[PDB]
Every structure is written in structure tokens, then in C-alpha cells.
Paper text:
In the present work, we report the structural and functional characterization of the first thermostable archaeal dehydrogenase (AlDHPyr1147). The kinetic data showed that AlDHPyr1147 is strictly specific for NADP+ and is active with aliphatic aldehydes. According to gel filtration, AlDHPyr1147 is a tetramer. The AlDHPyr1147 subunit consists of three domains: the coenzyme-binding domain (residues 1–256, 443–470), the catalytic domain (residues 257–442), and the oligomerization domain (residues 122–144, 470–491).
The crystal of Holo-2 was grown by cocrystallization of the apo form with NADP+, whereas the crystal of Holo-3 was prepared by soaking crystals of the apo form in a solution of NADP+ and isobutyraldehyde. In Holo-2, the conformations of the coenzyme and the active site residues are very similar to those in the Holo-1 structure. The main difference is in the conformation of Glu253. In Holo-2, Glu253 has two conformations, the “inside” and “intermediate” conformations. In the latter conformation, the γ-carboxyl group of Glu253 is directed away from the active site and is at a distance of 2.7 Ǻ from O_Phe449. In this conformation, Glu253 is not involved in a hydrogen bond with nitrogen of Gly255, and the carbonyl oxygen of Leu254 is rotated by 180°. It should be noted that, as follows from the crystallization conditions for the Holo-2 structure, the coenzyme is in the oxidized form. While the nicotinamide part of the coenzyme is flexible and adopts different conformations, the adenine part of the coenzyme is well ordered in all complexes of AlDHPyr1147. The adenine part of the coenzyme is fixed in a narrow cleft between helix 211–230 and helix 230–244; the 5′-phosphate of the adenosine ribose forms hydrogen bonds with Lys178, Ser181, and Gly211.
Numbering used by the authors:
A (entry chain A): 3 to 490
B (entry chain B): 8 to 490
C (entry chain C): 2 to 490
D (entry chain D): 9 to 491
């Protein structure tokens, strides 16, 4: 419906343009074609949205949970009617294949539903008192106005996980989508508005991170920021947020290890590895970005892995439902992947396959004979350039897996219960998966990292933990003597 | 003479720089204590890091064993800790006795719970998938503490943090280093493996900042001034380390018209003025319903008048000892000087000699007085009269702080409605503002900080969740589609 | 729904059918004895067939992901939303409930189904610390198996659906036998389930006599658990019969809840509340305020205001309009029992302040003062509209009277004093207690249940889940070790 | 030896006694009470009188008592080990383990006493506070067996005491001195009178009186399934709840990828420790055909090495004697059936006095008594299976479902088998009788209901109590004529 409606901000129940009126033109990464004019908001716009959410907060937090749940179920109903719209935009604006965006839309449905389901069930605790005649309990309360700042790779699911769960437990929301995915953010507003949430409870401000996002992060009426993006941005936001003592949730990068032992079905290992390391062009935080394989099956693994990679079809992702890979999000991502490929070649790496690019498209590029000094070993490679590392034993497997600043997810493939468990215990990561892909994700599990991959957990009640606080309350039923004045 | 404790060894700071600490009671010398630098902090940090794996991997029952031994040791040093809390900290007998009893309970509480911190088994939305969540320790944890309750605050942090398999670098407040050194004495005698607990005595902005900015420190739990906390949270950003921040308070104590007024004044005096008002959850702003204010004010001032201020070493019946240092006396004078100049009525107190200060009580206060706007960490207190419960709440919430708070009343509806409406991390009906148990979530909102400490809440602060799955079936994948 | 058009049948393994024996009886309205429908009179073979159907379906139903059972329950919720007018009409004409009563039960039933659906994916086990090195130690939740659901006639929809929806949610299958006085409500439940398309045998309905059909369920070896709401005696018999095959039970038995009123209350408000709490659904509520206890200082004005509001209650054909206050008792036997209660009180010198008449199945609320502990209406559950008011001198006395009963389901105190409220809440012996509200407060996710003769276990949300699942400790050991025998080694 | 009722050691009301002898050589051990119903009634009435003051002190006081009881137990360790051997037939190593685990049980109960939490709920109603308290059930009956009399009794007693129930304890008639020593320990620990009561007597007399009494709120029982069914039915008269820890016939499944020698060594410990007289003994050994030959050879090899002797002679005795001659008779019955049905007796069968040499059978089928019944003694069948499906079918072909184990290195096979085997507990690559102080221990099917260990014990002997506070007034629907 972009052919009949202007893309706008959503502030205090109203779709409207930024106060300056300034806009930019969102183009498709597929063919550079125009998608829509979109707001280029500034600080006054963020402030208006923040004030709207702050003024809406008390009423929203004080209604019974069941009523917030009702609003989220209504949102879910609206989402279901809007699925194709979301799929269409995820593809032409974000470059996602039919399969990727179908996955994203199906998961988003589950996220909204999960948030609705859990709203009424987030519990506090009744405690024993060490004192006589004392009732001692612990309540759960909303943090307040919550800033939601998101990336471009899974813009729908990542945004809605944060928005629906944050809204469910009685916070209001100021939402700033990634500048490469603004129409997705706008469709989210369309959804919310049609679900008729009270004005100010949810607000959309479209504009630059360093301007609109920074305002959200430094404003005293914002209680908490939940953020998903680059670790460098996370560190910046964490620093900025300190000024007003607001808490943060930081879902940052990853360089996930996929560990492949010698007792596996090697053909299966390769099929799983291709999917985990290259789905959505590798632009996934929990992409299998460093493939680690036991020497005993390495030659056969490498051959199969490449075989299946050679079958990957790259095309305009609107062409049909069977396209494997779309383009990268912009030209900067292409240039960066060229730097990764060139650095790996210069250092003596063997390029097994791929390496061409055109427009924003970038082929899978696979390397062996890499060492720890390679950029594609030291940095997050948010794209389809992937190293394969050969190791002699499980000790080395772990050493390499852990030889990174990151610590989001990870996986081992093996049929041996002992090796599976020891490697799982020893790999330093927020999440781990035995015999599955690295990017496994469920709507209600604690999703998050350690080390440079961030802080906190999201999904279900973990999302609730991030944006509530505990409130110890006592009642004393007896009177007592006090120690001062002692002369009594 | 006092030393650091690093990797199982009591040792001098690497520069040998020492410093003479004195007693707030009479200026007489107490000890020679380290003046450590960044290099010392790093040595403790590297120790803790290298002890971490062995410490975290032993079964929890083992860590609990160490803590029970520590409890055993602590119980033998009770009077030592009491003496130093009085001599170095200026605490009265009753105050330090209370602190030593609470400390006994804190260490015991952490031992009790070590074996019992659980993860979760989850339902999977997928077929043939086991899906569970483990608890894992954060790593090496910096522990930075204040001077007012240096023993109990330090131990709640040290003991609970150790319990769940974290190693510790500890830096006590510069005015209470000997309390710190005794803590290391107790830990050493409990025989915890080397590097698991490290003490470094040095300046906050040098040693503390090293802990806060170091790459191998996973988490810092901190108690102190709100401004210090904001600084610490900002420095922590660089390494994405997490923080627990227990900062200031300006706790409201609300008194309604249906109370036992005499009882209310007795409660108010203890809550507002215990330990000379140098308590984070001290009742720092007293708020009273107009219908009982005159009688309440007369009674409160009457019991304040009965307070005995003296050398806390003299005997067990001393109500108030001195403030910790001359900077605190200077600050209290500012609060009084400001209140007088804004038209406050000074009902009693204000006398100060050396570090001693007689509780100064004000009425005819308005929201612009520094003693209404700022945390008053000492014995200077406003009483404010309100007309109804709405104004009581408005005044209670008219602060940047939000640590604790309390209401005195026999009406169930007024009590609950006021508990609910008051913006604080903790609240208490018919008791003091500074109630504290070993295992309850202790902490604030607004400028009073972030996180909760006490029992399993301390465990939450210094561990993380780790989602682990096992998939028991193989499946087909969407790429490549030509398959 | 046309009452003359209804073909009422069992629902077993996916199909509506007649009892194997072809037997039936006629269900009549308690309002005027009008025929409602012929309904099955099933026997043991029908119960066995349902049980076998539930058992055979168990593994496929338990092993699917929780999310898939929630989907079924959401679908059930969708169907129920369409069937509301139908459910309300049968609750009124078959159960004798007023419009306002049945509207309330249907609204609550919708919340109960939704609640079970919401929680299905979120019932968690535990990851534990091991005292042994190299050991992983966890606790899974597993469904109990086939569960028998045996229900009463007073709130037949909401009590049935609480039990059924939560039980199904966590992967048990169900064999359900409604109260013989409310069979059509059970049949409409099976219609809802059938329309929601649950797999065959997951839910079964058998309409028949408790001592026949009900007993087969309780004694059968393929039944893992029985959840039962009814009379304390029936419960005690069920608990005994269940021991044979070591199946567990949930027992929601009678109450005789106290409503304690202190001297500091708004007395007029206390009176209005007490009328509602003591007499809604003609007192036919387990958590009805069955023994009103008031403080001497407000007793006289309280009794005046309370009797005044009772006098205002409109007794009438509950089908007539929406504003009828009270309808008939469920049947003639209930009227006769209430007559015994009234007669025993009059005979013992109790003072009857109002009511005590009755016509057909309709009974006029009878209020007594000047009673003592030997009165039957103080010693027994009075499941109908006969209520004693006891006057007390102080809070200690209020508590002693409150606790002087074999029962222990719920309770309430009215007071504005936080200390008296909490101390009374603490001293009263009941599974549930409400400060400044009615005795029969109930939410979909709270633990509902009693102590003493009022039963065992709790229902509502995760507590229903606790009843019909078990904990399963599983360990993995990652190191080999030496063993102490043979020591020669 | 006497009863312990309301703070006093005393002989039975009737004065009736009996002589308990050693299973090892028949010699006299002690005279013990033969109590009757009046004794059980005196104990119950005492527990009941004592309940309210015990349930209402703070949890921390009860924990304190348990910590006291723990220190007494530590002093009494050798006395317990001695009696468990001479009265129980236990070897040194067995009774050492029992006492070591009993120490952990008492400690564990103490640790958790302060931490049993209720819940704060969201209300679907406005202005409503909704919470759930934990309340102790009341007077609790504790009825126990003879095979692990100390640890089994102490798990039940310690945890039941912790959360504020009082106890009436009737031990197994073949292990009464262990029950008396437990009353010694409790008395020395100084629990308030009536809180713990010991009544030594006949199960059908004393036990039944306990199970049927109005003032007993709950019964926790460990024993034979038939007994459990008896108790469950008698319990119904007073609607008291029960915990039933009944028999087991646990499967030990061995797959073809194991270290066969290790599997054999594990099986021998698992199947025959304490003469196989353990609920969770590996009583049905199931081995994959591809390693069945080697496994059976190694297994019999290690069984032959078992040294059977007077358990009092030294610390390296593997097996002592069965508890009484009736057990030996039952074991002969089991062997006589298996021989009659075509079983091959590979080793053992010999018996003298109460001693019995472990009898191992192969060529068995499902109709053998040693496959259909719990074999609570040293007769064990080995069954060979052709695949995992068949392993599970046999494993599940029993009325019992207590524990179970699989030995394998394949993650898939271990998990698939774990979830398929119908039991309350399951262990991968370990013995079937793993037990920790705080885990949920209990079975399904004929093996019992409920769970014991730490907070699971707490769930069994407490109830949830929903309480609300409604803060607003409202209009009610009747009388409808009322505005
Ligand atoms: N605690 C609670 O939550 C709660 C809630 C509501 C009501 N109640 C209690 O329910 C009671 C009134 O209901 P009611 O007259 O329906 O009670 P009931 O006579 O005990 O009947 C309850 C159910 O048990 C069945 N039944 C009867 N005998 C049986 C047997 N030997 N084996 C198995 N099932 C058998 C009945 O079938 P038939 O109809 O064929 O007899 C009925 O479906 C009151 O005491 C009330 O307090 C309790
Ligand atoms: N699930 C577990 O955790 C577990 C652990 C260990 C053992 N067990 C089981 O316990 C069984 C062997 O022990 P056992 O020979 O002592 O079993 P038992 O014959 O049932 O005796 C157990 C206890 O119940 C008492 N008792 C007997 N009849 C009673 C009655 N009618 N009412 C009340 N109490 C009565 C007994 O007293 P008297 O001695 O005077 O007869 C004894 O103290 C085996 O099945 C074993 O598997 C289970």
C-alpha cells in the first residue's frame, strides 16, 4: 500500500512527517530502484516521541496484565492479515529471499504470540523472613519508557521480539529502525495503530542513529535501551547511557564456531554447514562464521561443503520462491567483503570457490589454509566469506573456537555424548547447540552473548527480566523497642 | 601496619608507598596502610583470572565448604571486627554489634545457597530437541565498597560472589582499609585457594578505575555515591563489563494521622539518625500528616534531645559517635547554613566539635532546601508537614533518588496505596526505612542505582544464562534449493 | 439451540454415539420439570471404551510439541466464543442459574481455556547443581497419562473446563464424566472439542451414574490420575478406590467458609458484600460465605442491613429476564435438605429473621441468629440458601468460630485495619483467604483448593499442571570411576 | 532402647519388649520396645501439641536446630556405622556411604529451610494484591524400611522438620536401634519437646494407627508397593496426603559401543551392592547381543571375585548377609522358579544362615518371577537383546518404574532410550542408584507417588495458600434492583 500512503513517523497516535519535513529516498538493494521517500527525523522528533511515551506510561503500566495481553493478541490478528506485505518489503527493501522472509514472518507471529501469552504470568516471590511478625514479598514493576534500536538484517523479527515483550510487561516504547530498513519499521507502526494501542504507548521515529538514536540513549525520561547491532555501537551506547543511569540490553556481533568432529555423517555435516554459514548471505549474528573441522574427515568435508556451495543460486530475490541468496544490503558491505577476500588471499589463504560480485550481490567465497591473523578469523564477517580451519583434536577445536573476541552462539556436530558435552562446556559462548545450526532461535529462550557479543538476554521471560525491576516490600505486624536513645 | 593480599600472600604495594590512617574519634594514629597503584591492581586481577577456571569448575558443594569454614573463622574474629569498626569507622557498640551479627548471617546465607542456584528445562517448539538453560559465573569480579557499613556491605558482595564460582578483587573505601585487611585475614585463615580472593588497598580513582577498565574483569559490583556510580558505569562500557550499582538514597518516612504518635517518633529517631544518619537507607526526609504533626514534632525533638553523643569506645550505651571525617562535618555545616538562610526553623542541634555533630532538626522546609534536594549523608534532618496522602506521596517522590521508603499507619488501604505510589526499589509498612535481610533483593531505582543484591539476587548479578540444545533428529535445509 | 432438536450422546474416540447398552434417561429442568433431553445412561463398558481410547491416543498427544497442543486449545477457544449463547441457555435451563450467574461462568470459562493455552509452552523443569564432578543433572516435566475428570452440577461449565483444558494442555488425555444433573453442559463441551478438531481419543465424554461410570474410571489401571470436584464423602470414597492402582488424585471437596466482619467497616457495604457472597447461585457454591461472623459493636446494624438486602432479592424463573437474582435449587432433594437445616435451627431455638419458605424447587433464603455450634448449619456444609449469623466479642473469638469446622476451603475478613486483617488471615485455617472481598474469589491461574475436609491439591494455571505431571530426574555422567566392589580390585 | 515421646525416653505403655538379634550370627543385640496403639497416640498428640510453636518460629531458628542436629550427628558417626553393620548386615563401605550421605542430608535440609518461596501473582482484577504462601502440613508420619534405615529415615525427618512440620517416626522392626540412635541425636540437639517423636513397634499396629489418626496430616512412606497400597487406602479416611517410595525393578541397559569391562564392573556394583537390597538396584540387566558374550563373561568373572563374610571383620568385605532367613527363603524361591523355567544358572545360589551367594541367570524370559517381581536380594537375570527398540520394550515390561540406566557413548541412542524408558529417574553412563540430597527422588507406575529430596521434600509436606487484598469497593450483581 506504498502506492497510496506516505511513509511517516508515528508519534502519540498520529502518523506524521518529521518536524523539519526533511526526507530521504529508500532504494532497493536488488536493482537500486526507488522504494519510498521516508522521514529523516531529528532530535525534536525523538523528544516528542519520548514525551509521548512518558505521558502514556502510568496508564499503560497500571492496567491489568490481561488487558495488555488483549492488545497483543489484537496485534497478532493484525499481523496475520499483513504477512504478505511484510514479506514483500523484507525482500525488496532488505534483499531477503522468499524462504528467508517466510521464515522471518512465521517467527515474528510466534514472537508476538509468545509476548501475549506470558504477560499475565510474570511472577514475583514470597519470602521467609528472618524476623518475627514480618510479611516479606517481591513485586515486579515496569522500568518505564524503553528505547528500541534495531539492525537491518532481520529487521522484523528482531524488532518485534523487543517491542512485543517490552510492551507486554507494561513499558512504553520509542522505536528507531535501521536506516536501511525503514519501511519495515513503518509497517510495524501500521500494525500497532490498526491494533489500536493507546496513543503514546508505541512510537516510531525514522532517522539517523547518531542523531535520533543518540537522543533516545541520552534522554533522562528513557529508563532502558534495548539494542541490537555492532559491538562498537554497543560500547558507544553503553557509555552514553551511563549519564542517566539507564540500563541497557546489548545484542552485539558474533563470530560463531561450527565444530565438526570425525564421527559425523560428513555429507549431512556439509549440508548443515552450508545452511548455517551462508543463509541470508551470512548476514546473521549467529551465522556459522568460522567452520572448524577434524583432520580425519576434513578432506571429504571440504569437498562436500564446496559441492553444495556450488549449487547455491544467486538472483533477484523477487524472481521466484527457490532463490538461495539475495544481494547484500548496500555497496559498503560489498566493499568490505572484497577487503576480507583480498586480505585472505594476500596472507596465503586458498580460495576454494567464489569471489565475484556485481551491484550489491556478493558470491560465497570459501577459504582454507588460514591462520589466526587473517581478518576473516579476527573480525565478524557479516557476509558470505567463510574460513574453514582444520584441527587435529578436540583440544585444538576448542582453542580455535575460543580464539575470538566474540561469544554469541556456536555448535558441535558429533555422535559421541562425551565429546559433545565437553566441547559444549568448554566453548565460551552465550548459547550452544549440539548437532544443529548455530543460529537456532526460539521465541521464549534466553538469547544473548558473552565477551564482545554483549550483555543480557532476550526472549520470553528473559526479555521481561531486562525491562522490569524487583520491588521488595514488607509489612511488620508487631511493635518493637529501638536501640537509641539507649537511656529508655 | 597493614598489607595487600594477592595470590595467597600478604605483601607490600609494589612501590612501598604507605600512608598513615587516623581515628575519627580523636585523630590518634591507627595504622600504616598501603597506597597502591595500578600495577598492584593488575597483579590482583591477573591472579583472580588465573584462579578462575579451577574455582568455577569445582562442584558448588566444595565452594560452600570453603564458605562454611569462612563462617567458622569469622565467628572467631567477631570482637576484632567490632573494635576496628568502632576505632576506624566511628561506629557505636550497638551499631558495630549489629553489623557483625548481620555479617555472620550474610556469609552463612551465601554458603547455604551455593548448591541451590538452578537453571531451567524448557519446552521446545521443535520436535526432537532438548532445550535447557545453565547458570555460569561471570568471571573475575571487582568489589568496590564505602566506609559507613564497610564490613557488612563488603561481605554481602564478597561472599555471595564467591559462592557461585566467581573470583574477586576487593578494594575497600580509603577511610576503612583496616576493616578490609581483616577481611583478607579471615579469608586467608579459611584457606581459600590462592587468587580466588584478592585485597588491594589504594585510591578509588587509581586502583578502582584500573579494576573498572581492565579487560579481564567481567563484572564490577559497587556501592557508593551516585556520581561515582555514573563514572564507573561509563568507564565499564569500554569492555562491555556489567555492573551492580547501589548508590545514594534520600528515603522518605511517611507518618499518617492514625498512628501511635509516640511510637512513630521513637521509630523515626532510630531510622533517621542511627549511625549519625550515615546509612544509605536512612530515613532522610520525614513526612508527617498535619493532624498529628505538632505532637509528632514535639515527641521527635524530645527523643532526639535524649541521644547521647560521645566517644564510642567509652561504653556500650553510646547512641552516636563521630562523623567519619572533617569533610563530612564541613558538608553538614553547608546543609545547616543553607537551611537557615532559606528560612528554616532550627528546632535543635547543629553543635559540632571535632568530628562530632549533634543532630540538627529543621522545620519550615520547602522543596528548594539542599536538605530536600540532595542526599544528606549525616545527622541533619527535615520534617515536612503535608495535608493528605496525595501530598505525602508527591513530596516522597519529589527526589532524584529511590532506594527505600516507609509508611506508618494502621489503615490497610492507605498503606498499600502509598507503598504502590512511592517510587522506590524497596518499601516498608510500619517499620524503619533501612530494613535489610541477607537474602532479599536490596537496591534502588532512579538515581539510587541498578541491580539487586542479597542471596540469589546477588547470584543473578554475577552469573549469566546459557541456552544449550541437543537436536536428536536430522532434517533437510532450505539451501541449496536445487537439492 | 432447540431443546427438542438436541440428540445428546456420548463422545468416544472421535465420534458421538449411544451407550453400548442403548439405555437413556430424561433430563428435566429444575425450573418446572420440563423435559430438556434424553441423555445416555452409560455403564462400565462405555467407560472402559473411553479409557482405552484415551490410552491409545496418549503417546501421540504427549509427544507432539507443547506449541501444537496450545494451537488446539486456541482453536477450542475460538469455537467456545461462538458457542456462548448456547452455553448460557443450557446453564440456565438445565442448571437453574440466573442470567447474571451463567454470563459470569461463561466469561470465566473463556478465560480458563485461554489460560491453559497460554501456559502450555511455558511449564518448565530445572537444571540442578550436582554434588558430583563431571555430572549433568536436570529435571524434566512429563504428563501423568490418562486423566479422569469427574465434576459437579453447580458450576458445571467452568469447573469442567478448568480441569479439562489445563489437563489437556500439558499432554494428558481425558475421560470426562459430568454430573448427572448437568449432562447437556458436558455434551456441549464435547461438541466444542469436536469442532476444534482434537485428535480422536484425546478427549472423551461418558454420560452416566457416578457409582458406575465414575467408579470404573477411578478403579481402572490405565487411568493415571483423577481430578474430582464434589462432596467430601464422595471424595473420601474416591481416594480409597484410587489407592488400588496407586493413581494420584486432586480433590476439590466442600467448604464452609467464614466471612468475618469487624467493627471498623463500612457496615452497609459489609452487608451488600455478604448478601452476594452468602447467597449467589442460591448459596450453591463451594466457596459460598456459609457462616457469617460479625463483631458485637456493629452486629445489630449489620444484621438489619443484611436482612434488608436479602428481602430485596428477586426469586423467579431464571429464563424470564436478565435481572432475576435467584433461581431454583438443582432438584427436589436439595429443597428437602434445606428444610431439614431450617427445621433443626428452629427446633434448637435459633431465631429465624426472614425466609424459610419454598415452592417447587425454589427456596427462599432463610437467615438465622442466636445459633450455637451444635446447629447443623454450623456443623455441616450448607449447599443452599440457609445462613447463620454468629455475633462475637473480639478477634480471638472470631477466629475460634471461623476455625470451628471440619472444612477449610476459603474465607474472608472485612476490616480497614492492616494488623487485624493480617493476623486474622494468618490464624484462619483455610487453603485460601481474601481480605476485603467475597469468599468465592477465583482467577484462572491461581492455586484454588482447600485444607482439612475441603480436599487435597490445587487447580488453576501451573498448579493444574503440577497436579497432572510428574518430575523426572535425568543425569549424564562424563567420567569413568572406580567402584567399591569387589574390593579385591 | 526406649521410645522417645514429648522430650522423654520411655518404655512402652504395656511394658512389652522384644529381643533383636544380629543377622550375621544370631547373637543378641538389644531389647527393644514392642509399642502399641496407645503409644502411637501419645506420640501423635505430642507432635500435635507442639506443632503451632514449631511452625511459627522463623525458618532461621529451625535451620539453627538442624545445624545443631548436624553437629551432633558428626560426633555420632562411628556409633551409627557400628549399628548399621551389626543390626543391618551392612559392610563397612556400605554403612560408611550411608553415614556420609546422611551428613549431607541433614546439612541440606538446614541449608534450604530459609529459602522455600511462595509466589506473587498478576491479578486479572484491578486494585488487587494476589500472593501465595507456603504452609507446613502439620503432624507428619514417617515410616521407613530396613535396608538403608539411617539415610532413608534422615532424609524424611530432616526435611520434614525444616519447613515446620512435627514428626512421628516408626522405623522398620529389623532396624530399631538405628531409629533409637536417631532419637538420641535429636535429643542431644535439643529440639523442643514433641517436635520429634519415636515409636518402636509393629507396622500393622503402630504404623496403622499413625496412618489412620485424625491429627496426622501427611504420611511419608518408604517400603514395599503392596504396603504402600494398604497405606494409601487407610490414609483416605482422614484425607491425609501421602508420599510413597515403593519398590523398583530397574533396568540397566548396555549397548554395543561400550567399554565392556567397565560396563561389567559397573553392573556388578549396581546390581549387587548391599546384596542387591536396594530400591534402585540394577535388578534387570539388559545387554546388546553384539557384546553379550564378552559382557556375561566379564560380569560373572567379577561376581566370582566378591568376598562374602562377617561384615564386622574388616573394611574390604564386599557382601554381608541378608537381613533375615525369610529373605533367604524368598531368594531360594526366585532361584527355584528360574531353574524350573529353563534358566541357565551361571554362578552362585549357595546359602548358609542369612548369607547368600549372588545367583546369576541367563536364558530367561518375561514369565520368570525374577523378571515379573522386585527381587530385593542377590538374584539377577541377564537378558540379551537384538536392538534398541527391544532394549526399551524389555526395560519397560515391568510394573515398576523407579530408576534406570543406559551405558553407551552415542548421544542419540542415550537420549532416545532415556526418554523412552518409563521411570521416575534415569542415568546415562552411571549406576541406577545414583542419589543426591536435593534432587527429586521417586518413581512412577507401581514404584510410588511423590518426590523426596531438598525442596521436593518441602513440596510434599507443605501446601500453597492463596491470599488476596482487594483495595477498592465495587457494586455487586444481587440484588439487581439496587443502584
Ligand atoms: N472445592 C471445590 O472446588 C468445589 C466446587 C464446587 C462444588 N464443590 C462441592 O461439590 C459438592 C456438590 O456437588 P455434587 O452433588 O455434584 O457432589 P457429588 O454427589 O459428590 O458428585 C460429584 C461427581 O462425583 C460423581 N460420583 C458420585 N459417586 C461417585 C463414585 N462412587 N465414583 C465416582 N464418581 C462418583 C457424581 O456423579 P453423579 O451425578 O451420577 O452422582 C458427580 O459427577 C458440594 O460439596 C460442593 O462443595 C466443591
Ligand atoms: N522407593 C524408595 O525410595 C525405596 C528405598 C528403599 C526401599 N524401598 C522398598 O522397601 C521395600 C523393603 O522394605 P520393607 O521390608 O521394610 O517393606 P515393608 O514391609 O512395607 O515395611 C516398611 C515399613 O512399613 C511398616 N509397615 C508394615 N505394614 C504396615 C501397615 N499395615 N501400616 C503402616 N506401616 C506398616 C513396616 O513396619 P514393620 O517392619 O514392623 O513391619 C516398615 O517400617 C522394598 O520394596 C524396597 O524396594 C523403596
Amino acid at each position: 500500500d506504498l502506492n497510496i500512503m506516505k511513509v511517516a513517523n508515528y508519534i502519540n497516535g498520529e502518523f506524521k512527517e518529521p518536524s523539519t519535513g526533511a526526507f530521504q529516498v529508500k532504494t532497493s538493494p536488488v536493482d537500486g530502484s526507488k522504494i519510498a521517500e521516508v522521514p529523516r527525523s531529528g532530535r525534536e522528533d525523538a523528544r516528542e516521541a519520548i514525551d509521548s511515551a512518558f505521558e502514556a506510561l502510568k496508564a499503560w503500566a497500571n492496567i491489568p496484565a490481561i488487558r495488555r495481553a488483549e492488545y497483543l493478541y489484537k496485534m497478532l490478528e493484525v499481523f496475520r492479515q499483513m504477512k504478505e506485505d511484510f514479506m514483500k518489503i523484507l525482500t525488496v527493501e532488505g534483499g531477503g529471499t522468499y524462504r528467508k522472509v517466510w521464515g522471518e514472518v512465521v517467527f515474528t507471529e510466534r514472537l508476538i504470540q509468545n509476548a501475549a501469552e506470558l504477560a499475565r504470568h510474570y511472577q514475583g516471590r514470597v519470602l521467609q523472613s528472618d524476623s518475627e511478625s514480618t510479611i516479606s514479598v517481591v513485586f515486579k514493576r515496569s522500568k518505564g519508557v524503553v528505547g528500541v534500536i534495531t539492525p537491518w538484517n532481520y529487521p522484523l523479527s528482531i524488532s518485534m521480539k523487543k517491542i512485543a515483550h517490552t510492551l507486554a510487561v507494561g513499558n512504553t516504547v520509542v522505536y528507531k529502525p535501521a536506516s536501511d530498513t525503514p519501511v519495515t519499521g513503518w509497517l510495524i507502526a501500521q500494525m500497532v495503530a490498526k491494533a489500536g494501542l493507546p496513543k503514546g504507548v508505541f512510537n516510531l521515529v525514522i532517522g539517523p542513529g547518531p542523531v535520533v538514536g543518540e537522543e533516545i540513549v541520552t534522554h533522562k525520561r528513557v529508563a532502558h535501551v534495548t539494542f541490537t547491532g555492532e559491538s562498537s555501537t554497543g560500547r558507544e551506547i553503553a557509555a552514553k547511557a551511563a549519564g542517566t543511569l539507564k540500563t541497557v540490553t546489548l545484542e552485539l556481533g558474533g563470530s560463531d564456531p561450527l565444530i565438526i568432529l570425525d564421527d559425523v555423517d560428513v555429507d549431512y555435516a556439509a549440508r548443515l554447514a552450508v545452511f548455517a554459514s551462508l543463509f541470508h548471505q551470512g548476514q546473521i549474528c549467529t551465522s556459522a562464521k568460522r567452520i572448524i573441522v577434524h583432520k580425519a574427515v576434513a578432506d571429504k568435508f571440504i569437498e562436500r561443503y564446496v559441492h553444495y556451495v556450488k549449487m547455491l543460486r544467486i538472483d533477484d530475490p523477487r524472481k521466484d520462491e527457490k532463490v538461495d541468496l539475495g544481494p547484500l544490503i548496500n555497496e559498503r558491505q560489498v566493499a568490505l567483503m572484497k577487503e576480507f577476500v583480498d586480505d585472505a588471499v594476500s596472507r596465503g589463504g586458498r580460495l576454494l570457490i567464489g569471489g565475484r560480485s556485481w551491484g550489491n550481490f556478493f558470491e560465497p567465497a570459501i577459504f582454507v589454509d588460514v591462520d589466526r591473523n587473517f581478518r576473516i578469523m579476527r573480525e565478524e564477517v557479516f557476509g558470505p566469506v567463510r574460513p574453514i580451519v582444520v584441527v587435529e583434536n578436540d583440544d585444538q577445536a576448542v582453542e580455535v573456537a575460543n580464539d575470538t573476541d566474540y561469544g554469541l552462539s556456536g555448535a558441535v556436530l558429533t555422535n559421541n555424548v562425551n565429546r559433545a558435552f565437553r566441547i559444549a562446556e568448554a566453548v565460551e559462548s552465550g548459547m550452544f547447540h549440539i548437532n544443529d545450526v548455530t543460529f537456532l532461535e526460539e521465541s521464549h529462550v534466553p538469547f544473548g552473548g558473552i565477551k564482545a557479543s554483549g550483555v543480557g538476554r532476550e526472549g520470553g521471560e528473559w526479555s521481561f527480566h531486562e525491562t522490569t525491576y524487583d520491588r521488595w516490600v514488607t509489612v511488620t505486624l508487631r511493635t518493637r523497642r529501638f536501640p537509641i536513645p539507649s537511656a529508655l
